[PDB]
RNA sequence: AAUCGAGAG
């Protein structure tokens, strides 16, 4: 029957009963999942997580006694375990809206323990260190609300469906934004001209592959090509850089000859000449560079000695044991130890590459197109930067024992008391650190974690309105680095985003291009899929085994896994075997292969990319589910995947074998907002995006619980209603539950005249019926402990008596603590009054704001230590009432946003035949410039809709041509006895008679926007110019443009005016000191009656910068001959 | 939060909101025949009545006065 | 007489100390009542 | 008083 539906008994009855089962609307959690899942995968692993992994990788720092080959005793310093505490304390759970009310933290306890292990397993001593309060993430596993029914949220103080991987700190609720970076464990292949430049002989190309340790650690490893003929390696240690020979590293991976090098770069390609020369210059270098290096023993020492200091390598520590450190550490991090056997497989594929790319037969490969791209996301920077303070933790526990060993000199390495001694002298804020970085979004760490970026990670993450809260965990951002950059390309919207990341939501200004969002019904795969029979099945086809044969170059497809080579085998077997992989992957009934495997397999091509088949199970890997035509099934595919996939975007479009998916729904390329948009296939893309830009500046619905949310700003709309017009999915996101906007009754028509570009008019009777009533919370701390110290109990405190304190202060500051609940506050009134001892009288508290406000809540916060005292600590709610002025910015669903031109009286406004009066008028010649029809197709179907009293549903691409939305709202308006095109014919307001045309009037959404500014000084604070800022009463600075406007129209005395309103002798001051009872007169030491000084020096008009610049001239040393006028 | 007074015209609809809610809910009907045997023809009255989130039975639970 | 818990929702007063025991709940978060006070205002 | 972030024109 009807398309849509506004289901008002079901939202009524979810009201009044939240759910004590399962939520409603689903989607909404698989939209916030990417956080939950990281911050759990972080601790719920198959083994610790990836905290314990890490921990464990973190090392074995080392130091030795100095007890008299042999030098002492070890430490092995090392870490076992991280747990968790949620609550907080005779132990008690502690909520969230929890340092919400109490505007501080929402941390929990980090768990640590580590060993003392004086020698190789004689003396360990393991101890639980907890190291601070970690803050945790909301609706994650470290939360109390973890898997709570929506009725248990209710009763905790929650909202009643509340989900958020934002971080409560200070009470601010900020968090992690997502970052995108390179790909996991595939080389690509760059041509940047940096490369050239790092130095001479230096070539532009150069492959690049940024692997990944099992903790989620990345390290990147480049392959800078030299003019002269030799491949140099690169990496990165601590802050710096440090570069070596490839052919050293290739030797020193395994016991390998230079003949299997042959064959491992050039695999039956020995015809060709140019890779064969070019490899016999390699060896030949190498072999005259280095003779002595002989052993893989040796080159394992040579490597140790030249990377002793570089890796804080121990002193007890051999040379073949330091280079096989690093080459287990540095090089190829994603393989894992024990796997060298396969990273000296990867780089000859490496250097395979990179010789394709010198001879141009491969490709390049764009490091900003999203077939390489990939995001980490929160929880996973979480867990990395955590990893490294806690590997700086054990550095400075060790650097503490080398101090005690310079100078203590009273050690013992096997004594508990002596440990406590280490201990109580080291830092145990490693909580207080991450809320630090939380806080500030400066990242400071040493290795860097290969990432670009310094300052800024943790976004405010406010909650204006419900979109821009839910928008805050959909951002991905390129990088800071990037937005510093002014290259466009950067900024194209590439084809190879189609499915992931919206083609329409993206803020328009300075970070245009960059504030990409992903599209809703995207997952990010936050878990290591089952990989490990993968290889097994795989064989199980027809490939050979990476080890048994030796094949390289583009002309045989490679086969890899996560980044381990595994097979080759011929481009058409490699096409069959993607094929069949695809056939059991989505088939299931298998125990491998999970459905989430990114499968890629790129056919040779002419002069193309570097061919191979391709797998990766990934971590964090972008997803997107789309049909599967072999089998009508779901099937998840990645970007890398995606483009050599012939995706179908409707399944009437379905070719005959040029289509394998067609992705259902195709609104799902989209972002929740843009999906919010009525008719978005109607309008102009700079509309839509202006729209998906003003819909999170909307006088929104934060939420229910703003009853204890204490915060700086929250705009709440007082009414709101469903969109008539609303899209499909609006109700599907429970959007309903956080309405803004009202249906409005809207006239296209030009007849006030006051509204020609923007403006617009709003019925000011419809006004005083509360057309739109938003209001504005606002909260701010009030405390007298901001200069007390923990020792000094402050002689100040609240309240206010024996003095002579001035009456009338009991008006609204009336009672024995705080001013009434209830009250009128207008501007400097007595906000809070405390008695101080100090001056031995009581002071209060101005207003200090502009608007009079009315108190709305004031609660009392107590310390989290046992800081009895006496409470010196309130945060009190103001509530300010905004009713629309004129100049507010109203805005439709389409980017048509204005402002309030002058609330037109209701007599005066035209009215129609049925006798409503329109409430909002715009003006039609916005639209040809605009092109927004789907203005006009909501007001067309707002208007069937409030008739029929049917919902309209507004989904993008269910009209084609042949059904067009005109005609199919026409329809129902002519059933319902109305104009057919909307045309209703109306009268004048004050001549009162017939227009000469039908009004096009109907019914369309509007939403009110924050943007509500006037600033006028005389006289008041002021080098003597006028102060700046508009709350400080300051005035407006005159530029140099206008300036310059001044001048052109020769208005002299104009510019005088915006601009203002001496020695004699020197002509460059010193003077008025009468002595008794004579008149001021001059003295100036640079010149009784002239004593000795001068007594040439009469008053002039100069501005007073001027005496300033003297001085500051006088100081400078500088004087020139000011030519002082005469009388 | 139902609006007392409609926006356009000005016809009363505090009233009718609970009783729109019985003649959907204890009657089997749809909302066009519910807005009118309510008495409700010009959609400028329709509006309110046909589209309101009732935010006060969502918005009220969180009662400061009474113990959870 | 005022302060009301805002945990277990009870009615209280404060003696210039322990402001933040709830004698009942002991949280340390208080929360002010609104009280019989006149209020001029505007129907406008 | 400076720095960063949000913006608006
Ligand atoms: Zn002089
Ligand atoms: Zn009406
Ligand atoms: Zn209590």
Redesign the pocket.
Known sequence: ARTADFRTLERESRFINPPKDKSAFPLLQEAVQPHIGSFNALTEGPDGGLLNLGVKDIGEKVIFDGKPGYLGNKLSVSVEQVSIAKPMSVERKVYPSESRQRLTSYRGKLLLKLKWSVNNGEENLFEVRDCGGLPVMLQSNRCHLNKMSPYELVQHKEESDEIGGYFIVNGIEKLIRMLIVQRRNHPMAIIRPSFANRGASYSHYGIQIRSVRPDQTSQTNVLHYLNDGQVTFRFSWRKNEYLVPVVMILKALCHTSDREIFDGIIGNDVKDSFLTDRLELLLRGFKKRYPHLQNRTQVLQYLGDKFRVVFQASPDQSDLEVGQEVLDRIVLVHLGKDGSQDKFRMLLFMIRKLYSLVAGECSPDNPDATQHQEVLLGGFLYGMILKEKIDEYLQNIIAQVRMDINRGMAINFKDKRYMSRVLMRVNENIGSKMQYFLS??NLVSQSGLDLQQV??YT??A?KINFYRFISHFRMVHRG?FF?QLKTTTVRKLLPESWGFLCPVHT?????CGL?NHFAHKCRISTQQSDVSRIPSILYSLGVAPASHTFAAGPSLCCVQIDGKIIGWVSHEQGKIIADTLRYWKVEGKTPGLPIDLEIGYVPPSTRGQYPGLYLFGGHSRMLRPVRYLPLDKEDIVGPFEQVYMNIAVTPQEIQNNVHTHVEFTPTNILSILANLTPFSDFNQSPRNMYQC??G??TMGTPGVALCHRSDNKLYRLQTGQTPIVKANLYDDYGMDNFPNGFNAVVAVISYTGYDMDDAMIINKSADERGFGYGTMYKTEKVDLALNRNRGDPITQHFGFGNDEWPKEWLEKLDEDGLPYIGTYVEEGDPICAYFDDTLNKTKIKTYHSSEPAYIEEVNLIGDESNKFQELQTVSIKYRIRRTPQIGD?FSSRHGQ?GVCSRKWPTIDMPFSETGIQPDIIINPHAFPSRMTIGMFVESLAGKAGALHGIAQDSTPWIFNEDDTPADYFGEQLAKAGYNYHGNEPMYSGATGEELRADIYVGVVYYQRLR?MKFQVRSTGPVTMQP??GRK?HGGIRVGEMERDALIGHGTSFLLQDRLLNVCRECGSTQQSVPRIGSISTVCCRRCDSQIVGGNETTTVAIPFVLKYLDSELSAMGIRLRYNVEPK | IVPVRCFSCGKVVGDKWESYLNLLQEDELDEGTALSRLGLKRYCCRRMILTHVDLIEKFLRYNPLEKR | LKYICAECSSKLSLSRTDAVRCKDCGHRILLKARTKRLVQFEAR
Do not use: C, Y
């Not at chain 1, 803020?507 to 970070?511: A, E, F, I, M, N």
């Open positions: 500030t979004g300052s800024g976004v405010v406010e800071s937005a803020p328009d200004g300075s970070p504030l830009q003003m999170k500046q910015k946003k943007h102060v700046k400080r």
